[PDB]
Design a protein around this ligand. Sequence first.
Ligand SMILES: [Mg+2]
Ligand SMILES: [Mg+2]
Ligand SMILES: [Mg+2]
Ligand SMILES: [Mg+2]
Ligand SMILES: [Mg+2]
Ligand SMILES: [Mg+2]
Ligand SMILES: [Mg+2]
Ligand SMILES: [Mg+2]
Ligand SMILES: [Mg+2]
Ligand SMILES: [Mg+2]
Ligand SMILES: [Mg+2]
Ligand SMILES: [Mg+2]
Ligand SMILES: [Mg+2]
Ligand SMILES: [Mg+2]
Ligand SMILES: [Mg+2]
Ligand SMILES: [Mg+2]
Ligand SMILES: [Mg+2]
Ligand SMILES: [Mg+2]
Ligand SMILES: [Mg+2]
Ligand SMILES: [Mg+2]
Ligand SMILES: [Mg+2]
Ligand SMILES: [Mg+2]
Ligand SMILES: [Mg+2]
Ligand SMILES: [Mg+2]
Ligand SMILES: [Mg+2]
Ligand SMILES: [Mg+2]
Ligand SMILES: [Mg+2]
Ligand SMILES: [Mg+2]
Ligand SMILES: [Mg+2]
Ligand SMILES: [Mg+2]
Ligand SMILES: [Mg+2]
Ligand SMILES: [Mg+2]
Ligand SMILES: [Mg+2]
Ligand SMILES: [Mg+2]
Ligand SMILES: [Mg+2]
Ligand SMILES: [Mg+2]
Ligand SMILES: [Mg+2]
Ligand SMILES: [Mg+2]
Ligand SMILES: [Mg+2]
Ligand SMILES: [Mg+2]
Ligand SMILES: [Mg+2]
Ligand SMILES: [Mg+2]
Ligand SMILES: [Mg+2]
Ligand SMILES: [Mg+2]
Ligand SMILES: [Mg+2]
Ligand SMILES: [Mg+2]
Ligand SMILES: [Mg+2]
Ligand SMILES: [Mg+2]
Ligand SMILES: [Mg+2]
Ligand SMILES: [Mg+2]
Ligand SMILES: [Mg+2]
Ligand SMILES: [Mg+2]
Ligand SMILES: [Mg+2]
Ligand SMILES: [Mg+2]
Ligand SMILES: [Mg+2]
Ligand SMILES: [Mg+2]
Ligand SMILES: [Mg+2]
Ligand SMILES: [Mg+2]
Ligand SMILES: [Mg+2]
Ligand SMILES: [Mg+2]
Ligand SMILES: [Mg+2]
Ligand SMILES: [Mg+2]
Ligand SMILES: [Mg+2]
Ligand SMILES: [Mg+2]
Ligand SMILES: [Mg+2]
Ligand SMILES: [Mg+2]
Ligand SMILES: [Mg+2]
Ligand SMILES: [Mg+2]
Ligand SMILES: [Mg+2]
Ligand SMILES: [Mg+2]
Ligand SMILES: [Mg+2]
Ligand SMILES: [Mg+2]
Ligand SMILES: [Mg+2]
Lengths: 386, 183, 63, 109
Amino acid sequence: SHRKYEAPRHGHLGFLPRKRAASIRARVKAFPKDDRSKPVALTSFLGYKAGMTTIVRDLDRPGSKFHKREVVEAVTVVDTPPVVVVGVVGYVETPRGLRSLTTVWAEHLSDEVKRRFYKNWYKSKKKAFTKYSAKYAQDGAGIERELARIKKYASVVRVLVHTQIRKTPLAQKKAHLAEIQLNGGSISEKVDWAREHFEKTVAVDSVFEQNEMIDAIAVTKGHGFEGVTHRWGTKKLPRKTHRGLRKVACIGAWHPAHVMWSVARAGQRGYHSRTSINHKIYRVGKGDDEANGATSFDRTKKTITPMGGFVHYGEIKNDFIMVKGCIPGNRKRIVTLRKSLYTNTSRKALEEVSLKWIDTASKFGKGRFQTPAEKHAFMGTLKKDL
Amino acid sequence: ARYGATSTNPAKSASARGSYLRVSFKNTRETAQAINGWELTKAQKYLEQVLDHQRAIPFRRFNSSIGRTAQGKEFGVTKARWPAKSVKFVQGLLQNAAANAEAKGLDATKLYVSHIQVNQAPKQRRRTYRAHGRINKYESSPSHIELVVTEKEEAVAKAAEKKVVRLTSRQRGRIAAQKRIAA
Amino acid sequence: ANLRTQKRLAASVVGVGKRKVWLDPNETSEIAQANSRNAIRKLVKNGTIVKKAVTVHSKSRTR
Amino acid sequence: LKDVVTREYTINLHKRLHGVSFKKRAPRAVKEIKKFAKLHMGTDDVRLAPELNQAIWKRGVKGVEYRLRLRISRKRNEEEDAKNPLFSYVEPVLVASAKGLQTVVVEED
RNA sequence: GAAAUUGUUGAAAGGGAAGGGCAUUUGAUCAGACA
RNA sequence: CGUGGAGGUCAGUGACGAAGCCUAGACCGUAAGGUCGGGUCGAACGGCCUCUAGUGCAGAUCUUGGUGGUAGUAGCAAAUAUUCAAAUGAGAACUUUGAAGACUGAAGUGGGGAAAGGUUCCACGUCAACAGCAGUUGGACGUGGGUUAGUCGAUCCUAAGA
RNA sequence: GUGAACAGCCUCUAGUUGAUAGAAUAAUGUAGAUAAGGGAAGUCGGCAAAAUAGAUCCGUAACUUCGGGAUAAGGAUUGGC
Ligand SMILES: [Mg+2]
Ligand SMILES: [Mg+2]
Ligand SMILES: [Mg+2]
Ligand SMILES: [Mg+2]
Ligand SMILES: [Mg+2]
Ligand SMILES: [Mg+2]
Ligand SMILES: [Mg+2]
Ligand SMILES: [Mg+2]
Ligand SMILES: [Mg+2]
Ligand SMILES: [Mg+2]
Ligand SMILES: [Mg+2]
Ligand SMILES: [Mg+2]
Ligand SMILES: [Mg+2]
Ligand SMILES: [Mg+2]
Ligand SMILES: [Mg+2]
Ligand SMILES: [Mg+2]
Ligand SMILES: [Mg+2]
Ligand SMILES: [Mg+2]
Ligand SMILES: [Mg+2]
Ligand SMILES: [Mg+2]
Ligand SMILES: [Mg+2]
Ligand SMILES: [Mg+2]
Ligand SMILES: [Mg+2]
Ligand SMILES: [Mg+2]
Ligand SMILES: [Mg+2]
Ligand SMILES: [Mg+2]
Ligand SMILES: [Mg+2]
Ligand SMILES: [Mg+2]
Ligand SMILES: [Mg+2]
Ligand SMILES: [Mg+2]
Ligand SMILES: [Mg+2]
Ligand SMILES: [Mg+2]
Ligand SMILES: [Mg+2]
Ligand SMILES: [Mg+2]
Ligand SMILES: [Mg+2]
Ligand SMILES: [Mg+2]
Ligand SMILES: [Mg+2]
Ligand SMILES: [Mg+2]
Ligand SMILES: [Mg+2]
Ligand SMILES: [Mg+2]
Ligand SMILES: [Mg+2]
Ligand SMILES: [Mg+2]
Ligand SMILES: [Mg+2]
Ligand SMILES: [Mg+2]
Ligand SMILES: [Mg+2]
Ligand SMILES: [Mg+2]
Ligand SMILES: [Mg+2]
Ligand SMILES: [Mg+2]
Ligand SMILES: [Mg+2]
Ligand SMILES: [Mg+2]
Ligand SMILES: [Mg+2]
Ligand SMILES: [Mg+2]
Ligand SMILES: [Mg+2]
Ligand SMILES: [Mg+2]
Ligand SMILES: [Mg+2]
Ligand SMILES: [Mg+2]
Ligand SMILES: [Mg+2]
Ligand SMILES: [Mg+2]
Ligand SMILES: [Mg+2]
Ligand SMILES: [Mg+2]
Ligand SMILES: [Mg+2]
Ligand SMILES: [Mg+2]
Ligand SMILES: [Mg+2]
Ligand SMILES: [Mg+2]
Ligand SMILES: [Mg+2]
Ligand SMILES: [Mg+2]
Ligand SMILES: [Mg+2]
Ligand SMILES: [Mg+2]
Ligand SMILES: [Mg+2]
Ligand SMILES: [Mg+2]
Ligand SMILES: [Mg+2]
Ligand SMILES: [Mg+2]
Ligand SMILES: [Mg+2]
């Protein structure tokens, strides 16, 4: 008859269905617009969400009440050992849209990738790619003409890369393989780069720089079957109400005589694909680098790994991307980081940060000490020890 | 005797019954059907495993609002269950057939079950008390079970009709010249 | 094997509650033949059925 | 083949019981132990000494000690022949504290 | 020892009911007339 | 057109198979229906002219009986709680015994009675039904045994009342 | 035993351990609890819920049929040795 009072609907209809995703690895649905005047490099990267901590930095923003004053800010850390290049795939344009034409593969393939191609690895004869590997033998003939044919046709080129999941504290030995569009100039220059990087390795620093705005593509945490109140942020019904109250009182008018797509119902919650954007990179780590977690002002040699280690993850012994704030997906999940799709000007983007101090105390309680050293200092001598 | 339609040669088959068994008609229907046509030997090892919850029985008719299980994938099915009491009654009949086969002098290694048929025994009446002074039937749904084991025999040779061919005057003018013309 | 009767009889004969009669699990065939009071009697007197002690409710803390 | 062994294990009951309803903690423990014997002895058949039972129920249902020092013994089966020729007896070991011991083989004869 | 209703076996059809009417293909099945 | 029963008749059919029942086999009739074959069955039954009626069903929230879909579904969630081992038995989550853990907490889940029941008591045997899982157990089933009074009640007396 | 107590709570004697069971711990429930800052803004309505409570001492208004109102209200205090 007409609402009575007016309110916004609940929740966004541009995120339906609120279904479990088809895969733990959320898909890159879009790559940066290509400028072929620049050198060749990846346009994304693979890693694993390890955890969060706190940061202190002076903020630089003429006009704000916190100009040249410190702020304290949340950051996530994703574990990011070098990705390894094992294939090139070339796409061509058709009136039916983009279509994959060939894939060329490297000759040798890590067991790490090799075992993604399997479901019962232990029992198997592991024959994956063994006839392919032979194609090199014969001078090279066939792999050439394929590379060669990518070159001739092909509107875009992506690289087949995979993570070195063993360089990571995780249990799962089976790595993550994935296509990354390649944007540096010229089709042929692209596939050469790809050909050149077969079996060889690619670093993060060649993909991201400090203060870059990047996007995170990941599968959201799971929560299972969810009632309507938490899933859609619906009003709790009154305490007096029969047969339950975390519900919707009116699931619909009498006509249309059908529950409609647009009304909140109980169902799966989380495990969704998201493409979260505009996460500025506060740090690019270095695994071989002691004093990862140190700064210009801190100096105290220590790595980013909190005392006792990242809760529910492990240690971070590889290079990492420290990104301001928080990110979709949870600890241990594969996560794609993507080059931004637009040159943002913002001032917020553009501000070149410089960390003053990275927090490094335990996360497994009310952590009181940055380092065993500090703890040793403050506590004195204990009944164990020397 | 007088079992349901069979097509098997009784000289190489043995058979068994239960009548008025207090097992669920519907569950044992599903398990009977699950064993049907099987190698008698593969069938027994199979029922054993059901009892162990290592493989299951696909429910295919009497199965609405049944549970779901990985153990149906074997059979292309999502709903499968593990009907204990059915299985033990069925395998008991099977054990019987075995014994009779042995007695007829039949080769056990060739025994498959070539007929297994459950249908509905007379119901058994018990009753329950519902709200407001009421009473309702509360009923057993029992089963008769019959199976037949038969020795596998291979091949079938050939042999059949001849269809007496019949064709017009002009239909053999072509033919009579088809060969006089060519080969 | 079913010693209820012998147990109840045991309780009655000894003069205390069943909760405290001990039926010796190794003379379980001997006990079973004990159908009568006279033969529970001389089963009690030779340790095949023992009285089983009271449960202390001490007064020490009260005191 | 077989192997016929005795060892003495400590089992963490605390993480196995963490969460479980109070009225099910002693019962759960009986079970979880059985399970523990099968995981080590290979053996579907697991039997608990009536004194072991006592050790478990020593403090009431919900009061199960966080660690137990067991002695698990693999033995051969007897009479009417069960499915499998092996089985395990479990006994409590009279130890001063269950806390602190590695798993040890008992040299039997 | 009918029917409702059921099991098995054989045959057939089935993209949000089924069943029906005129007509013919196809499959199965069968009467008659011929001499 | 069809059904129960009656008079007449065809010296009608039939244990060498009446009647009935089954049959996407045949044939006659526009139709109500009629005829045959084959299977099943077992003792009676039909055509024709007439006579006679308790004479034809889809319904009546029809009567009685039987049967479904629903559905292996709702459910079997109040009364704090169970556990190890032996014994027995085809069979043991549930019986027996031992051990342990608890409960009722003397305003009792203790020890007796009145009304009412009527053998439920007790023993031996024992599981087809019953005890909304089970069963080797039972207030179940089978076969037996058992209730002792000068003093305990009745019986006597009177009450409202009859 | 505690305590004013035949209360509640724990125990001895006696008696039970009966009441389908197993595995999990989604939604929504039923029953039991908690919640920062605000404090009835919720709602027909404080419905529900929360707050209060024993004892000892101190203190106690209008009004009244002088019997009350009254544990009015408002306060302090309480273990062990
Ligand atoms: Mg409006
Ligand atoms: Mg899917
Ligand atoms: Mg090609
Ligand atoms: Mg919730
Ligand atoms: Mg909200
Ligand atoms: Mg939220
Ligand atoms: Mg209400
Ligand atoms: Mg609402
Ligand atoms: Mg923490
Ligand atoms: Mg029959
Ligand atoms: Mg059905
Ligand atoms: Mg059905
Ligand atoms: Mg279901
Ligand atoms: Mg359901
Ligand atoms: Mg459904
Ligand atoms: Mg599972
Ligand atoms: Mg299915
Ligand atoms: Mg009911
Ligand atoms: Mg009821
Ligand atoms: Mg009533
Ligand atoms: Mg011809
Ligand atoms: Mg010709
Ligand atoms: Mg919990
Ligand atoms: Mg008959
Ligand atoms: Mg037609
Ligand atoms: Mg007429
Ligand atoms: Mg007539
Ligand atoms: Mg009549
Ligand atoms: Mg004819
Ligand atoms: Mg005939
Ligand atoms: Mg006939
Ligand atoms: Mg006769
Ligand atoms: Mg007439
Ligand atoms: Mg009439
Ligand atoms: Mg009609
Ligand atoms: Mg009718
Ligand atoms: Mg009708
Ligand atoms: Mg009509
Ligand atoms: Mg009717
Ligand atoms: Mg009816
Ligand atoms: Mg059932
Ligand atoms: Mg159910
Ligand atoms: Mg309950
Ligand atoms: Mg209920
Ligand atoms: Mg029980
Ligand atoms: Mg108590
Ligand atoms: Mg009391
Ligand atoms: Mg009782
Ligand atoms: Mg009495
Ligand atoms: Mg009575
Ligand atoms: Mg009795
Ligand atoms: Mg029985
Ligand atoms: Mg009864
Ligand atoms: Mg029952
Ligand atoms: Mg029974
Ligand atoms: Mg009797
Ligand atoms: Mg009698
Ligand atoms: Mg007297
Ligand atoms: Mg007298
Ligand atoms: Mg009693
Ligand atoms: Mg109940
Ligand atoms: Mg349950
Ligand atoms: Mg609050
Ligand atoms: Mg206030
Ligand atoms: Mg208001
Ligand atoms: Mg106010
Ligand atoms: Mg209002
Ligand atoms: Mg009002
Ligand atoms: Mg109002
Ligand atoms: Mg109230
Ligand atoms: Mg409070
Ligand atoms: Mg007042
Ligand atoms: Mg004091």
